[PDB]
Design a protein around this nucleic acid. Structure first.
Lengths: 90, 94, 78, 102, 106, 90, 77, 91
DNA sequence: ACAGGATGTATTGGCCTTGAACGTGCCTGGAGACTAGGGAGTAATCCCCTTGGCGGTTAAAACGCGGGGGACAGCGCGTACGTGCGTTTAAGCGGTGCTAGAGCTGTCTACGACCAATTGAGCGGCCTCGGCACCGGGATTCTCCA
DNA sequence: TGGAGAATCCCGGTGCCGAGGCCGCTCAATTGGTCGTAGACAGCTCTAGCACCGCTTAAACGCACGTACGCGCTGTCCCCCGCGTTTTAACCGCCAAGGGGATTACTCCCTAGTCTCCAGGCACGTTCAAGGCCAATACATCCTGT
């Protein structure tokens, strides 16, 4: 189980004419795994501090604001909220 | 009249033997609130929160000063300069 | 404004506990800037914690959690 | 039909939901959290890949190697702050020679 | 008839409370019978070590009560405890007396 | 909920004539909580790495070896093994 | 086997670090530092290996040890 | 002495290959591992990871050592510089 | 080198307040005895992969020589930081009064966990062709001298 | 020296090997239905964070002087640098042989879940021995004229 297909689709969206080697795709998989672990751990910690049993979108938003720096966090929050609104409208 | 350096060593000995806070409390509280105003308005603070902030800040500054003093003796000097703070923070990753 | 309440004798006292014997005249402004940056980071994290909990008051536990997030654990405040 | 199509994403929403439910993070997982996490991950990957593709295009190359990823990461302040304690295999270093040495 | 699990293991730390804290922190789905007996013993040993050192530090100052200064001195004068608590700040602890040799009078 | 009673019992075992203050007790409680969290997190990660769903004394032993320095680890392992043996035999 | 880390190799490592001039006592110091680093990492990796009752040290073990020391490595699993 | 050294700095900061021979490193790793467990087998990817990490660590340490040396108004690096960098790093 | 001399500094002895240690109720949380289901401790087998040995080539390591650049010590000058005194400023301590907001309780609902069918998205192999690295071959460009 | 002589960059050829596309299959994601409990909201109580006032005195500020130190300059010498033989051993390709990593099936015993009982730990309400404090005082320490 890896993230190769999705990284490839994102690459073809951003750069429709550039390929990627097999030793860079491992770097990208490691990157995704590390960021997932960071965000999930922070969200779990936030839920534990407040005596809650559920991880919601609010926890993920707060974890993103706590981990990511500066102007990355704002764009990440915008993308997340847009995705959730689109999912709920569907 | 004591020679230049004796009172400094005496003060080092005095302040390395005590555990009290070295910054006044009201000015630190005002600074904390002023910094906090740029994140959220109409904020209230517990007393223990500002106490914790003061403890952490003073510990951080003392450690940074120890590293700064180590950087100055490496250059054959006894006077600390901003370059020493800048080198210590660069090596620390800050 | 309030950064000037961190006075020159206070910084000299802090440097004496670090074992410094001689201090230059340009150290004080640098120290004030460093302290401002450190406080900004810690207070930002603590206020984020306070906002998540739907509160209008910052508690000591928020400061402890923030400091431990920045890798500076503090004992004695809970 | 797929939970990724309803959110306009290319990252798997179901797999993220499975990984959240079996990693011992909480007892219950809400229905919006996988979507948020997938969107954030997709955004970060897109940022890194855009910068790396530009770095590869600066040279006369059409493939991304780890060197381009390293050049992209170190030349951006935000990504450098995020990935500050991470070592990339076969990435090298940014070429910088300090003055006084010339 | 009832006997505590700490009396069964010869411990002073609460095995029953550690068991509850292990099942409510989301560390696994099942917890073994001997894990809270091992964890409690380790915690008790570490506490006893720190307390021995701090008590000696307090007796060396003609005192009969431990204060944070004694704990700080004990932790920073021991090579292994210092490595275990190298990124920890102790409130009202202070620092270790240390002046560089070049700064002393000639 | 705190660890004051047990810290006091251990203190009167090692130093029968020495007392403790309140701030020192707070520091001791923080210490116990911190080390508990460290060992529990390491044991959870070890269980997750090997695709197991239980935390046994084996994971606690390995976490103690990974976290404590040198002789402290050896003495902690000895104490834990003695406690588990005495518990099982009873 | 510590002498297999040769003077030419340490010079190359210093050149990648942007160093112009090197003293003659650097090489032994570098050897000692490398030995300490390797000892810590390998101890943690073999501890991960003894758990799971294996006799072969894997790459994921060294990855876990490096992550545990705050030196996360990408590209090996 | 400036010319060849500067050329080598330019050359080695542009490449990405390993700078330590691989047979000696394997022997060093295996010799160190003997003091923890006897009759140990290594994967061919564990040793590569160890070497990558070691080289990255050493290059960063030399980058810090150079800064200390320049702080002392020197162009040559000395053991005192490594020691100061490691003390400030917390190692 | 040494001997007064003013100064900081380590000794007692006596009061003397708060906080540390103790004793009581009582209310949860820990313990005891069953029951039932699946996690994991054991065997047994297949085949990947690790280790070991060997011959040949050649790129890299080692050794020695000769010379110049850089580290380090000594000296002089001048700026600026330590020391001590007299003058302003605001931190600290109580007391009072006032809400804003944190913590707890009760009830009702909608959201998330299970569970059983079902079908297509995603690894796994198998090809196939161009990016890229390499390989010469000129063309162009940095360092040092009459 | 603005003339040489290597270093580097720019040109095609090329070929090879690794990325990218295509097809068969199975297992994990989607859907529909139900339920029970976690989170949401309203009403209530009362603690604690904020604000003002006045006095007192401990720090903060300011000022002038003289000294120790930062910084630049110069000289010596020795130790790193660069370069040309020899000599060593890493690297590569090939073959050979078990160790042990990785699955799979069967079975037992260990951990979760429930109900009942009961004692260990927590919140309050006195008290009397630590430790901080104040004069009073004999030593240990710094600086300087001789």
């Amino acid at each position: 189980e890896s993230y190769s297909v999705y990284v490839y689709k994102v690459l073809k969206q951003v750069h429709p004419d550039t390929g990627i080697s097999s030793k860079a795709m491992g770097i990208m998989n490691s990157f995704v795994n590390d960021i997932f672990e960071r965000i999930a751990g922070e969200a779990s910690r936030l839920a534990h501090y407040n005596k809650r049993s559920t991880i919601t979108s609010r926890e993920i938003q707060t974890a993103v604001r706590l981990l990511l720096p500066g102007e990355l966090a704002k764009h990440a929050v915008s993308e997340g909220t847009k995705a959730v609104t689109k999912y709920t409208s569907s | 009249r004591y020679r230049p350096g004796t009172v400094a060593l005496r003060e080092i000995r005095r302040y390395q033997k005590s555990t009290e806070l070295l910054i006044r409390k009201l000015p630190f509280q005002r600074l904390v609130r002023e910094i906090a105003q740029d994140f959220k308005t109409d904020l209230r603070f517990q007393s223990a929160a500002i106490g914790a902030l003061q403890e952490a800040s003073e510990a951080y500054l003392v450690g940074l000063f120890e590293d700064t003093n180590l950087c100055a003796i490496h250059a054959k000097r006894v006077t600390i300069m901003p370059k020493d703070i800048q080198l210590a923070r660069r090596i620390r990753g800050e | 404004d309030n950064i000037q309440g961190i006075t020159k004798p206070a910084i000299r006292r802090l440097a004496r506990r670090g074992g410094v014997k001689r201090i230059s005249g340009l150290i004080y402004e640098e120290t004030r800037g460093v302290l401002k940056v450190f406080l900004e980071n810690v207070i930002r994290d603590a206020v984020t914690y306070t906002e998540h909990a739907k509160r209008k008051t910052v508690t000591a536990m928020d400061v402890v959690y923030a400091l431990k997030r920045q890798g500076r654990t503090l004992y004695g405040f809970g | 039909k797929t939970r990724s199509s309803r959110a306009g994403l290319q990252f798997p929403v179901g797999r993220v939901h499975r990984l959240l439910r079996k990693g011992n993070y909480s007892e219950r997982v809400g229905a919006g959290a996988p979507v948020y996490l997938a969107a954030v991950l997709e955004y970060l990957t897109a940022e890194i890949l855009e910068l790396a593709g530009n770095a590869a295009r600066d040279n006369k190359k059409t493939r991304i190697i780890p060197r381009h990823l390293q050049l992209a990461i170190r030349n951006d302040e935000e990504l450098n702050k995020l990935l500050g304690r991470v070592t990339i295999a076969q990435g090298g270093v940014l070429p910088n020679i300090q003055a006084v040495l010339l």
